[PDB]
Amino acid sequence: REETVRPDLAASFNDWTYDQLTQPPGTAYLPAPDPLTGPTTIRDKVLSAEGEQLAG
Amino acid sequence: HFADFVDDRRATAAGNRPNYIGFRDNFIGMMYYNSGSNTGSFSSQTQQLN
């Protein structure tokens, strides 16, 4: 079992940096979309200005 | 109550006015309709939608 100790963890013993550690899983960075392009953002500014009061 | 009060034997008596006290027609005024300061609310749960 000690034949497979992956010998660059033992070189930086107690000095491990980020690429030698198991990270929690997660996707990459996708940018947040425009909140103007939301499905009900502009139409709430248009249907109310026609005279309606909206709720729901 | 009374209708005339001169001396303690010489008074007269009339019945009081009839006063009926009951609820309104169709229960008007039981419920705050069109009072904005305290409105009722019909909404689903996830209740951000009065």
- Cα distance between residue B50 and residue B34, in whole Å: 14
* Structure token pair of residue A41: 């953002």
Resolution (A): 3.4
Contact B50/B39 with Cβ under 8 angstroms? yes
Question: B43: nearest CA in chain A?
Answer: A56
Q: Cα B2 vs. chain centroid, distance in angstroms?
A: 27
Instruction: Give φ, ψ of B44 to 5 degrees.
Output: -75, 170
Experiment type: cryo-EM
Contact B32/B39 with Cβ under 8 angstroms? yes
Contact B37/B30 with Cβ under 8 angstroms? no
* Residue-wise DSSP of chain B: --SB-SSTTS-B--PPPP----PPGGGTTSS--S-GGG------SS----
Instruction: Give φ, ψ of B12 to 5 degrees.
Output: -125, 165
Q: Give the distance from residue A38's alpha carbon to the nearest chain B alpha carbon, in angstroms.
A: 19
